[PDB]
Design a protein around this ligand. Structure first.
Ligand SMILES: [Mg+2]
Ligand SMILES: [Mg+2]
Ligand SMILES: [Mg+2]
Ligand SMILES: [Mg+2]
Ligand SMILES: [Mg+2]
Ligand SMILES: [Mg+2]
Ligand SMILES: [Mg+2]
Ligand SMILES: [Mg+2]
Ligand SMILES: [Mg+2]
Ligand SMILES: [Mg+2]
Ligand SMILES: [Mg+2]
Ligand SMILES: [Mg+2]
Ligand SMILES: [Mg+2]
Ligand SMILES: [Mg+2]
Ligand SMILES: [Mg+2]
Ligand SMILES: [Mg+2]
Ligand SMILES: [Mg+2]
Ligand SMILES: [Mg+2]
Ligand SMILES: [Mg+2]
Ligand SMILES: [Mg+2]
Ligand SMILES: [Mg+2]
Ligand SMILES: [Mg+2]
Ligand SMILES: [Mg+2]
Ligand SMILES: [Mg+2]
Ligand SMILES: [Mg+2]
Ligand SMILES: [Mg+2]
Ligand SMILES: [Mg+2]
Ligand SMILES: [Mg+2]
Ligand SMILES: [Mg+2]
Ligand SMILES: [Mg+2]
Ligand SMILES: [Mg+2]
Ligand SMILES: [Mg+2]
Ligand SMILES: [Mg+2]
Ligand SMILES: [Mg+2]
Ligand SMILES: [Mg+2]
Ligand SMILES: [Mg+2]
Lengths: 99, 173, 62, 50, 158, 183, 52
RNA sequence: GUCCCACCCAUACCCCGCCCUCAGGGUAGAAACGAUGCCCUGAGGAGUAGGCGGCCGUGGAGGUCAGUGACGAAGCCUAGG
RNA sequence: UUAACUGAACGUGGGCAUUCGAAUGUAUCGACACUAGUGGGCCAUUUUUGGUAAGCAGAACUGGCGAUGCGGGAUGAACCG
RNA sequence: CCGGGACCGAGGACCGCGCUCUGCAAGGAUGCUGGCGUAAUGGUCACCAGCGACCCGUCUUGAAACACGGACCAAGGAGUCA
């Protein structure tokens, strides 16, 4: 929700357009039943039949550096004590710092 | 780090030739469940012919200390790798939880033998129920009868931003 | 004086700079290198097929 | 409005269903293995050199 | 050093252990058509019609059929481009390729699936999907009590 | 960094005529307006061809027009964004309505004498603003002496650069087996 | 001309999602669990947890 | 030696302003426009060898500015703009 | 070509989709023309060959410096960012 | 849901999505007030101060080099034409 609401940009005709209105989402994804930002969030979160189209419509999110920083050495795996790899549910704290 | 004991139960992926495979349980001391599952797969690779790709995690649970307010003596049997071989050693700790005993064990091994986390295998952690089964003198002197001691030459707490003091501090409290 | 003998150090990057071009395939390949007897027969087979197709429009009605 | 209301109800019901499936397995004396994750978020953390 | 035609073919062109001598005749009994996809595998006992060692282990398309050989089109990567090479290979070095058997069985399976779905009124899935993450399920420990494992102490075995 | 293969890539097509012809500029303005305000792809194609260099606008002859006037195209208006030339080999010019960038004197005279009609591109824009009932024709782009020299190399049968033609000019050693090898 | 964060600007939030006002008013973020006396964890589960 | 917390700062990341480049659109029954202009939107910016584009400056020629000038041209000096 | 319309190749006519037959991306597809500089390289991980070894000599893959600033390694072409 | 602080105010009639709808915090700052109205702000130069800063051109894998040319200044000075 927070990623889509704060850093949500659609790829409209090759341009990065902020998602400030439901009209943009309906215009670019209405053929798939997605006509609102809540529809886009639902499709992404539930991995619906049009997840490919929704995710590709979303311009790649451009996050800031985490507010609390990284671990002391961030280029090891999360298991080793770094930040790389799969941290599973623990990416939510990283997203909250980075977003 | 700050650890927590996890019961990790895993399983080989069921096949047509072997439905209902055997369930394997381990006790893992890890900072989090990701590391707990990683260590489980590492030890299961060591012991059985199961990998993470050919298996699955049936369960992960936290084993809390049942009496964290009771002082206990713990014996830890461990296997560790030095710079020139592998050794087994048994050590003792005085803590209120298995997690605290394991953390003290890691710190003590790092301090005395330069053993990193990667090179230590915790074979067994046991709470010594009695007193006569305490084997180390540094735990015996703590379980001595009517134990009491003073705290000599104790430095008083002074704020590090109070640069100058008008009288010389005392070390008798 | 002596110098370096040979190297392939940068060749992969140079090749991939503008892509590895794979000549596009076509519906009708060239009959070059095909058996000349087959080519000689195929010429007349095509002749007859075209003639029959034209007669079909002109009244043969196959 | 109606679609968002339905989505909120759906999210809450899915959470409660996961919780109750795990609880009922624990009560019956089995282990409920939850479904593996279907979505990931991936963040590039290193730079573009080397 | 040398750059002869068969340099470095000591093992590739050799026949395997206990694979020498008589050549099975199904090789000669096979038939090939223009457009067929064949695998090239050099037989060391047949020195006639031998393709160069580059084409050993390559897959191509038959473009010409002759008395005892087929012409095969291969694509060879030289520098920054691909070159279309045409090689005349005797049948003993040519094997029909299973590189398209999955697709050739899928096309007819999809045809029957389409006609059956049209008859039955419900659409089916024609395209293959990648392996998906496993679904939720319950594992009973009844008569399957978990076995607790611990790391083993170190000891010498010599 | 953003790690892009391409940055600041410029369009590879012309956006305006390199010519300084004032009437061509007026024609380009007219067809810019037409291509912006109409749905017809014909207007856009004409506008793009108005930018093109002379080698990209090869001449179209009356015989080439007559070839395409057959098979149900007799009543269509022929549109050529190029010069329309005469052809001596065509003895009988069919009746035709042609709009072209320019006509040679003989081509215009023969079209008018055959009962046909000659138009400029602005006249074409006036009568057929959407290009309805039009036949758009292009001349032979590769029919050029320079193209015969392009891509010269072994086994490519292109034309070499020679000062003269004869037995003493590029015909021995590399062109016949009696002189070592052929190409 | 100015990207406004819906998580800070409630007007933008209502523009994008009219259900946000109803969510806040009905306190759907504070829905408590359904009633019922919870069954206790089985002794077999506890024994397995503390087995080793 | 190991573990933990807070903090410091790169031209990197995030938000905003501006410059340029590139790209995509609008603009005539013209109350119309250095249309080679204006308006809207998005992204991008290291660089030797080298390529291309646009501009500044100098001697001379044609046209033009009814151009400047002994009431001071050109040149030269200038901790004045 | 076969004993033969029986095959080979190329087709005519008819039909398919209630779904063009994995994923992801497409922040670029293809063709052509003319031409610059370069054709002494060096460094590093892994694999190495010669050599006792070398800041030695020679190779494979990839990344770098050359052509490159900036923060860090006090100091530095290549190390870390 | 409440505070405390910092930097910023691009655009310039209306138009649109909207809301808690006589209006609004909704497609980008306004309202009120004070001092001065001049070297006050601001610019330029000289100097001190904190931090930073090797001599250019060239050949070169590599130049600040214990590599070569250059004491200084004015004028001339090198891809032209057929
Ligand atoms: Mg902070
Ligand atoms: Mg760090
Ligand atoms: Mg030499
Ligand atoms: Mg050399
Ligand atoms: Mg290129
Ligand atoms: Mg940038
Ligand atoms: Mg040849
Ligand atoms: Mg002779
Ligand atoms: Mg001779
Ligand atoms: Mg912006
Ligand atoms: Mg209860
Ligand atoms: Mg920018
Ligand atoms: Mg640049
Ligand atoms: Mg002169
Ligand atoms: Mg004067
Ligand atoms: Mg060259
Ligand atoms: Mg040479
Ligand atoms: Mg050369
Ligand atoms: Mg050298
Ligand atoms: Mg070397
Ligand atoms: Mg050397
Ligand atoms: Mg150089
Ligand atoms: Mg660099
Ligand atoms: Mg540095
Ligand atoms: Mg050095
Ligand atoms: Mg001042
Ligand atoms: Mg100073
Ligand atoms: Mg300094
Ligand atoms: Mg040297
Ligand atoms: Mg130098
Ligand atoms: Mg020196
Ligand atoms: Mg020198
Ligand atoms: Mg010299
Ligand atoms: Mg000197
Ligand atoms: Mg002079
Ligand atoms: Mg001079």
């Amino acid at each position: 929700r927070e990623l889509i609401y704060k850093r949500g940009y659609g790829k409209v005709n090759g341009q990065r357009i902020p998602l400030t209105d439901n009209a943009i989402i309906e215009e670019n994804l209405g053929k798939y039943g997605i006509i609102c930002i809540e529809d886009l969030i639902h499709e992404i979160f539930t991995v619906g039949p049009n997840f490919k189209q929704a995710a590709n419509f979303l311009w790649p999110f451009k996050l800031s550096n985490p507010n609390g920083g990284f671990r002391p050495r961030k280029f090891k795996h999360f298991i080793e004590g770094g930040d790389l790899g799969n941290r599973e549910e623990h990416i939510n704290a990283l997203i909250r710092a980075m977003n | 780090g700050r650890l927590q004991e996890y019961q990790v139960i895993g399983r080989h992926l069921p096949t047509e030739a072997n439905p209902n495979p055997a369930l394997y349980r381990m006790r893992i001391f890890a900072p989090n469940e990701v590391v707990a599952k990683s260590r489980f797969w590492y030890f299961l690779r060591g012991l059985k012919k199961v990998k993470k790709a050919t298996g699955e995690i049936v369960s992960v649970n936290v084993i809390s200390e049942k009496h964290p307010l009771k002082v206990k003596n713990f014996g830890i049997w461990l296997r560790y790798d030095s710079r020139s071989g592998t050794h087994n050693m048994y050590k003792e700790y005085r803590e209120t939880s298995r997690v605290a005993a394991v953390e003290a064990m890691y710190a003590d091994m790092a301090a005395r033998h330069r053993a990193r986390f990667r090179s230590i295998h915790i074979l067994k952690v046991v709470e010594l129920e009695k007193t006569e089964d305490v084997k180390r003198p540094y735990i015996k002197q703590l379980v001595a009868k009517n134990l009491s001691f003073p705290l000599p030459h104790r430095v008083p707490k002074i704020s590090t931003k109070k640069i100058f003091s008008a009288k010389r501090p005392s070390t008798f409290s | 004086a002596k110098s370096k003998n040979s190297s392939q150090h940068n060749q992969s990057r140079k090749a991939h700079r503008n892509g590895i071009k794979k000549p596009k395939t076509q519906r009708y390949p060239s009959l070059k290198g095909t058996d000349p007897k087959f080519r000689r027969n195929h010429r007349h087979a095509l002749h007859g097929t075209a003639k029959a197709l034209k007669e079909f429009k002109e009244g043969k009605r196959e | 409005f109606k679609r968002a209301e339905k989505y909120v109800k759906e999210y809450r019901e899915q959470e409660r269903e996961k919780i109750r499936l795990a609880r009922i397995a624990k009560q019956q004396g089995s282990f409920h293995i939850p479904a593996e994750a279907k979505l990931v978020f991936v963040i590039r953390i290193k730079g573009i050199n080397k | 050093h040398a750059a002869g035609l068969r340099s470095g073919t000591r093992y590739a062109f050799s026949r395997g252990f206990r694979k020498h001598g008589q050549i099975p005749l199904s090789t000669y009994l096979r038939t090939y058509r223009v457009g067929d996809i064949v695998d090239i595998k050099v037989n060391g006992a047949v020195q006639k019609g031998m393709p160069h060692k580059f084409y050993h282990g390559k897959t191509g398309v038959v473009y010409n059929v002759t008395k005892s050989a087929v012409g095969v089109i291969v694509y060879k990567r030289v520098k920054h481009r691909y070159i279309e090479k045409r090689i005349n290979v005797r049948i003993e070095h040519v094997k029909p390729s299973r590189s398209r058997e999955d697709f050739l069985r899928r096309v007819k399976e999809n045809a029957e699936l389409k006609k059956k779905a049209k008859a039955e009124g419900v659409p089916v899935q024609l395209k293959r999907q990648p392996a998906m993450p496993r679904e939720a399920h319950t594992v009973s420990i009844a008569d399957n009590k978990p076995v607790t494992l611990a790391p083993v102490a170190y000891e010498t075995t010599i | 960094g953003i790690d892009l293969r391409w940055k600041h890539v410029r369009s590879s097509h012309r956006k305006a005529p390199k010519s300084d012809n004032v009437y061509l500029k007026l024609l380009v303005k007219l067809y810019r307006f037409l291509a912006r305000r109409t749905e017809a792809p014909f207007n856009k194609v004409v506008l793009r061809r108005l930018f093109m260099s002379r080698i990209n606008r090869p001449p179209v002859s009356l015989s080439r027009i007559a070839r395409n006037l057959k098979n149900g195209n007799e009543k269509k208006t022929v549109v050529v964004v190029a010069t329309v030339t005469d052809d001596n080999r065509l003895l009988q010019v069919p009746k035709m309505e042609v709009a072209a960038l320019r006509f040679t004197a003989k081509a215009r005279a023969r079209i008018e004498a055959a009962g046909g009609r000659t138009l400029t591109l602005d006249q074409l824009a006036l009568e057929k603003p959407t290009g309805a009932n039009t036949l758009l024709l292009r001349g032979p782009k590769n029919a050029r002496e320079a193209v015969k020299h392009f891509g010269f190399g072994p086994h490519k049968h292109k034309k070499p650069y020679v000062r003269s033609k004869g037995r003493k000019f590029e015909r021995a050693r590399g062109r016949r087996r009696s002189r070592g090898f052929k190409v | 001309v100015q990207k406004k964060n819906p998580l800070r600007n409630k007007q933008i939030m209502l523009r994008l999602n009219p259900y946000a006002s109803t969510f806040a008013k009905e306190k759907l973020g504070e829905v408590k669990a359904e009633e019922g006396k919870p069954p206790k964890v089985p002794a077999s589960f506890k024994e397995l947890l503390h087995e080793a």
